[PDB]
Specification:
The structure is cut from a larger assembly and holds chains A (199 residues) and B (670 residues). Chain A has a domain of 87 residues: RNA-binding S4 domain (Structural Genomics Hypothetical 15.5 Kd Protein In mrcA-pckA Intergenic Region, Chain A). In chain A, 43% of the residues lie in helices and 9% in strands. Chain A has 9 helices and 5 strands. Chain A has a 5-stranded antiparallel beta sheet. In chain A, a hairpin with a 4-residue loop joins strand 4 and strand 5. The longest helix of chain A is centred in the first third of the chain and has 15 residues. Chain B is α+β, with helices and mostly antiparallel strands and 670 residues long. Chain B folds into 5 domains: 262 residues, P-loop containing nucleotide triphosphate hydrolases (Rossmann fold); 119 residues, Elongation Factor Tu (Ef-tu), domain 3; 78 residues, Alpha-Beta Plaits (2-Layer Sandwich); 139 residues, Ribosomal Protein S5, domain 2, CATH 3.30.230.10; 71 residues, Alpha-Beta Plaits (2-Layer Sandwich), CATH 3.30.70. Chain B contains 15 helices and 37 strands. Classes of the chains: A alpha+beta (199), B alpha+beta (670). The chains hardly touch. Bound molecules: the ligand CC(=O)O[C@H]1C[C@@]2(C)[C@@H](C[C@@H](O)[C@H]3[C@@]4(C)CC[C@@H](O)[C@@H](C)[C@@H]4CC[C@@]32C)/C1=C(\CCC=C1CCCC1)C(=O)O, guanosine-5'-diphosphate (GDP) and magnesium ion (3 copies). Chain A binds one RNA strand of 569 nucleotides through helix 1, helix 2, helix 3, helix 4 and helix 7. It is classed as ribosome. Keywords: ribosome, fusidic acid, EF-G, antibiotic. The entry is titled "Staphylococcus aureus 70S ribosome with elongation factor G locked with fusidic acid cyclopentane in post-translocational state".
Chain lengths: 199, 670
RNA sequence: AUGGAGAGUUUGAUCCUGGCUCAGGAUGAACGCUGGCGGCGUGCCUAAUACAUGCAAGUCGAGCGAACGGACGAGAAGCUUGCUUCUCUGAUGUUAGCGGCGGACGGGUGAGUAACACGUGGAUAACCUACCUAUAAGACUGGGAUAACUUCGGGAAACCGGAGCUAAUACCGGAUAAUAUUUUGAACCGCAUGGUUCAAAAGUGAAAGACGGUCUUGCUGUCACUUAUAGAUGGAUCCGCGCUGCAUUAGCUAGUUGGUAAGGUAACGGCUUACCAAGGCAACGAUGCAUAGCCGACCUGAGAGGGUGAUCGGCCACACUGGAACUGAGACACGGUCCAGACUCCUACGGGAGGCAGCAGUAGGGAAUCUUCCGCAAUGGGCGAAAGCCUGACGGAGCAACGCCGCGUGAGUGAUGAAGGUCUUCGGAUCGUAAAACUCUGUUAUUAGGGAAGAACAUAUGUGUAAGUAACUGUGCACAUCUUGACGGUACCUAAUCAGAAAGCCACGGCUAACUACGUGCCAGCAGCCGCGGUAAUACGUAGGUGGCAAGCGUUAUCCGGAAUUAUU
């Protein structure tokens, strides 16, 4: 991916398992760095808003500029700004592929789509930023239908959200409808992010 | 497409000689003959064609004041033609250019011009070559006739005589050598063969065998020796009356090297200075060239004359100025001919050309391919020999003055300008009085900045000759919280060059330890300002040994004022003196001028430290006042016939004589 | 409902008032450090400074004469029947010249302009309009020249001058013809002036041929032509309203304000000129001074508002400075003319040539802004019936992280918490799943193949069908067939090889996300503001770690915000 740093250190900073396993927080749930251990300072409100924004951004593996642009368009959509931003983040091809389970890690799914092993409606899409919409299908490239990584990931029967309908035999997923807040991760307080981008 | 002339057929040569030897006349005649089946010289280098060979010619100046041009031309040139006045042979500037060419390893051919002049003596000129220069030079021709009688030239290599029937340079008759001169021609040929054999072992054996040398074999041996810079062919003629110019061009073709025959060039990578890169004459290699001249042409704009060592480059492309580390757009490429400038689409290795459009590319810079990062060896120019304090007559033009100075420094590496902090004056350094005079006139007219020049001011120093205990007391207690300070300091003359030394012999805390640094700072500040003539005081030991202090009134400033008052009283009581910088001057010159040099040194109020031989000359070591060293180069050159050279560096400070010190004090006071 | 956050700083402490400063957005940006790629944009803001060099406006032989070349192919035999001339016929063509049209478009710039310049809304019963389209009537009969060309003469050249001859769709006389112009009768109508339509007389105003078809002692197709009428297009004038600072600018104006007459213009009108009067403007800001192209829009703000007028489009103005007209439907004309002035260059000294605020480029100024590129293949324009030619408009390459957007610099398992850096209470803590090792992928890169669209066409050729003709060619249309790409063998697709080439910038005292050690010691230094530094500095410099961003990151400059700190809200 574009960010190639210690995701474990990032998870420790942000107090969330970006991978979802919890391995990062199992042993050392405190922040990285020399002062990590014995850290007892309290975060200001701006610090809390920044931490929430960074949690969501590093969870979805986006850069600040694209994150802000997505926030803007979500705000321009009708509805609740934070929920719309979260569902739009989910609707990204990386997120859809990861939820379908064609890869174990979000960064792995990003690299797969970037190297072009995925097809939407039977057509290649190299851009992880691609925004999927209801009624679309995500497939896999024929030359890569038998990739070790993809087959191994499909073996592990991960949970498939309600807004996605996946068939592992064909390695074919369908984006049935737009997600909901309950389906989307609950470890994120979208109101804090909305206020952060308010100021 | 394809280069019109090959590396083997390319010739880069420079014409060099003493003043008025005939460099320009020879260059003009060369261009005239090459341009036939309004000759100018404004072009830095001229391109011509002779017998299917491309010849680039650079004409150099003779004066020692303009040695920078000779240096920068010999840096990029392959061969040289050294012109000698027939009546005088080798002259001092002949020696200077010969030494520069030897340093740069440039093969040379000598051309004895002015054979028609009264007093012309070819044998004397050759003997001067042997003695003055210590050069393995031999004639390859003989003159039949001297002065007005000069009418033919005997080529010795092919033992063939050319008769010139007129001064027009045409209608030359190729005839057999006359019988009366045949013996002399054969003797000269034997001498030439011996001279070449002294360098060539195979030819030495061939000659010792008494077998007849082939024309081709002899020419090959001469070419080898010349290109090895072990032999010097000597020709004769008169450029003014058009005799020997064709033979001189033929010798240029036959004996002077090509960009292949010349030794290779070594450069450093930008990121790997230790790394060495050899840039051979190969079109297929990467492009590397050296920009050796920069001028402005009123029609085409800035011209950057450069010599290409390796590779090729096409007009309308991008190159890298590795020295500056920037990118340059080569928009147009020009070559100057005898009568016109021609735009050329490509330049190959071993060619001298001019780029139009280069910005921020100075002489000595390297222009390399965008991908490449080579940097060729730059040129080292002599340091200034004369210095003058310059200043504009109108202060409103001082910014113009600075800009002009910068531009002049960019145009001329040897001309320097710098500001002196102690005196504040702007000092211009140059190769000689003539150089600085020309530059001053150029600033006055070309840049319209009228300036006046003079001897630079000399920064003097003061010191204490006698020791004394003194006391400084500053007590302003008129009302309220006042100001109190008291010190008792022993001032002593320190050993010269040891600097200021502060000692703290305070016992019992009579002066609180808080204020002692303030006392030292006050002494330093008061010594910076002179006590006798305003010049800094130096080489003094100040020992603060006693004092007083009032707890409420005493303060840092009060103690500094007390120290200053103590210094004033010590100046009154210690008989201060004025010191002047003394320079270590090393003068190198032929032994026959040693008496004159030492006499001039002692007249400059300096002393002769010693003497010692060095090489074939002598070196004199002396100490002279910097003030008395003004205009020394001119006097040295007059004393040594231009053969003397010198260096000077600061050595120490010495006491100024009584009258000079009194004059300085009076001038500073009023 | 879709929309609005504050913080520091005056005090021993406090509340208030109050300025100052910061957090945000933006840029035609510049600079510093750094730097992989692709797409789409953007790129002299300064000197409306001066310009070398190349190019940026031609076209028509189906208007005209003349000249070059001279096919096919005429004659003697030099006995060389393959080469020969002039005594012929003489084709496809080409061109110096006259003539038509174009050159007033397209393109550049923002100097001037405070003005009906621009915007918006109207009016002209006060207007002009080539090429284009439609309708009606015509295109008849004569003439004299002059370019070209030949010859002489004068000039360095530019170019002139004399003589001789030659055309036209060049020019001119005459006939016929108006809603055009005058006069007398009308009828109806409007908004003063007036407007519309119907009669009868007087004066007067045109033109052309070219290339083809046919039943060829005469009709006809296409283009071209004249007049009249309309349409369309383009231009012109007038008016309401809107549109900038200064009163330490209060008076301004004498063709000025009105009238009568005349002239003038497409046109009304003091537009101009004579005579009569003394008017006209102005605190609702005249006059003067300063500044400025205007607008669609652009930035900012919750809004109200504030700021701006790059790119792109509309309008205006200008083309070295100033004045003037001629040609022309259209100009008082960027690459036209004349004069004056300043400035370059040539001269034979008598005289001549010129104007990058066209595209590149040069010098200069500047913190700063591109290559003297390919092509008319697409769109558009000029001429022509058409093929076609010209087009630095334009379509595309080159250069620049200048902006926005997209994708990279790897992905999975990895405790065995390796070595090493830093700190340490000497237990250890941290860089750290980070690393190494294993496994995988090829975005991207490299190599080799395939390779678009952008292309409609026009023209040419067959077939029909509509008008008109006696018929025919032609005309328009419909359907058909071959041919046209600079970009460029570029994008893109397919196959193979390697994690291997591809991470830097600022910050960490509060604001404000991020703290430890060492060095220094009111020095060196930092700083947006409060301030920090005098020996145990989270504020200086380095190191480790951390935070924010990421091919960018910071600094500076400028605008709006925060500022309810001009407060209508
Ligand atoms: C070979 C040639 O042509 O030399 C020329 C070129 C020359 C070397 C010139 C002398 C001098 O002006 C030079 C300097 C250093 C001057 C200072 C700067 O302006 C710089 C940029 C400049 C560079 C070169 C320059 C212009 C020459 C020259 C001497 C002229 C004769 C005399 C002068 C007084 C005595 C007689 C000559 O003709 O020999
Ligand atoms: N007698 C004589 N005079 C000459 C000869 N060549 C040159 N000169 C003159 O000597 C002077 C040298 O001038 P120049 O060529 O400028 O020489 P430079 O100073 O060496 O460049 C001029 O006056 C020439 O005319 C020659 O062969 N004979
Ligand atoms: Mg000379
Ligand atoms: Mg202006
Ligand atoms: Mg014009």
């Amino acid at each position: 991916a574009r960010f190639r740093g210690s995701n474990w250190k990032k998870s420790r900073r942000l107090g969330i398992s970006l991978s979802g396993t919890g391995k990062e927080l199992e042993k050392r749930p405190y922040a990285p760095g020399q002062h990590g251990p014995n850290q007892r300072k309290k975060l200001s409100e701006y610090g809390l808003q920044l931490r929430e924004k960074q949690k969501l951004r590093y969870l979805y593996g986006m850069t600040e500029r694209q994150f802000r642009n997505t926030f803007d368009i979500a705000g321009k959509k009708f509805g609740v700004h934070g929920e719309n931003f979260m569902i739009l983040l989910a609707s990204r091809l990386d997120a859809v592929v990861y939820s379908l389970g064609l890869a174990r890690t979000r960064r792995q799914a990003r690299q797969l789509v970037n190297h072009g092993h995925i097809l939407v409606d039977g057509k290649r899409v190299d851009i992880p930023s691609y925004s999927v919409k209801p009624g679309q299908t995500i497939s896999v490239r024929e030359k890569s239908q038998k990739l070790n990584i993809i087959v191994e990931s499909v073996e592990i029967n991960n949970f498939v959200p309600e807004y996605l309908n996946f068939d592992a035999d064909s390695l074919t997923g369908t984006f049935v409808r737009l997600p909901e807040r309950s389906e989307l991760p609950a470890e994120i307080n979208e109101q804090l992010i909305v206020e952060y981008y308010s100021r | 497409m394809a280069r019109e002339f090959s590396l083997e057929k390319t010739r880069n040569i420079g014409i060099m000689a003493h003043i008025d030897a005939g460099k320009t006349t020879t260059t003009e005649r060369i261009l005239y003959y090459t341009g036939r089946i309004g000759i100018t010289i404004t072009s830095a280098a001229t391109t011509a064609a002779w017998e299917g060979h491309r010849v680039n010619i650079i004409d150099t100046p003779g004066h020692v004041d303009f040695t920078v041009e000779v240096e920068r031309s010999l840096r990029v040139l392959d061969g040289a033609v050294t012109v000698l006045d027939a009546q005088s042979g080798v002259e001092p500037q002949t020696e200077t250019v010969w030494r520069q060419a030897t340093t740069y390893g440039v093969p040379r051919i000598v051309f004895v011009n002015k054979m028609d002049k009264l007093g012309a003596n070819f044998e004397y000129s050759v003997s001067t070559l042997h003695d003055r220069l210590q050069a393995n030079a031999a004639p390859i021709q003989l003159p039949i006739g001297a002065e007005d009688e000069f009418e033919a030239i005997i080529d010795l290599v092919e033992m063939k005589c050319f008769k010139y029937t007129n001064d027009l340079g045409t209608e030359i008759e190729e005839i057999e050598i006359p019988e009366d001169h045949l013996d002399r021609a054969e003797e000269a040929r034997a001498s030439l063969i011996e001279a070449v054999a002294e360098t060539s072992d195979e030819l030495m054996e061939k000659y010792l065998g008494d077998e007849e040398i082939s024309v081709s074999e002899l020419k090959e041996a001469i070419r080898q020796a010349t290109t090895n810079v072990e032999f010097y062919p000597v020709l004769c003629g008169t450029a003014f009356k058009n005799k020997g110019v064709q033979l001189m061009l033929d010798a240029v073709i036959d004996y002077l090297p090509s960009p292949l025959d010349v030794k290779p060039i070594i450069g450093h990578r930008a990121s790997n200075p230790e790394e060495e890169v050899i840039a051979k004459a190969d079109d297929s290699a990467e492009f590397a060239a050296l920009a050796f001249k920069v001028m402005t042409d009123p029609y085409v704009g800035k011209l950057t004359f450069f010599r290409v060592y390796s590779g090729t480059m096409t007009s309308g492309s991008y190159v890298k100025n590795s020295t500056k580390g920037k990118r340059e757009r080569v928009g147009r490429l020009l070559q100057m001919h005898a009568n016109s400038r021609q735009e050329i689409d490509t330049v190959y290795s071993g060619d001298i050309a001019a780029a139009v459009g280069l910005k921020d590319t100075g002489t000595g810079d390297t222009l390399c391919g965008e991908k490449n990062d080579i940097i060729l060896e730059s040129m080292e120019f002599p340091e200034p020999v004369i210095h003058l304090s310059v200043e504009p007559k109108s202060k409103a033009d001082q910014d113009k003055m600075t800009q002009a100075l910068v531009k002049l420094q960019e145009e001329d590496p040897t001309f320097h300008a710098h500001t002196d902090e102690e005196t504040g004056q702007v000092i211009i350094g140059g190769m000689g009085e003539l150089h600085l005079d020309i530059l001053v006139d150029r600033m006055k007219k070309e840049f319209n900045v009228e300036c006046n020049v003079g001897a630079p001011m000399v920064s003097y120093r003061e010191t204490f000759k006698s020791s004394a205990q003194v006391q400084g007391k500053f007590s302003r207690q008129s009302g309220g919280r006042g100001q109190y300070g008291d010190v008792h300091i022993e001032f002593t003359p320190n050993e010269t060059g040891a600097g200021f030394e502060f000692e703290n012999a305070i016992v019992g805390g009579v002066v609180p330890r808080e204020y002692i640094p303030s006392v030292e700072a006050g002494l330093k500040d008061a010594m910076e300002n002179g006590v006798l003539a305003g010049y800094p005081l130096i080489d003094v030991k100040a020992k603060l040994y006693d004092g007083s202090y009032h707890d409420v009134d005493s303060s840092e400033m009060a103690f500094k004022i007390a120290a200053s008052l103590a210094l004033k009283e010590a100046a009154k009581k210690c008989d201060p003196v004025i010191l002047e910088p003394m320079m270590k001057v090393t003068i190198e010159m032929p032994e026959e001028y040693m008496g004159d040099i030492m006499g001039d040194v002692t007249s400059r109020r300096g002393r002769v430290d010693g003497m010692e031989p060095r090489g074939n000359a002598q070196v004199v070591n002396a100490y002279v006042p910097l003030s008395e060293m003004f205009g020394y180069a001119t006097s040295l050159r007059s004393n040594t016939q231009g053969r003397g050279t010198y260096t000077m560096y600061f050595d120490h400070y010495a006491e100024v004589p009584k009258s000079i010190a009194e004059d300085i004090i009076k001038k500073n006071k009023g």
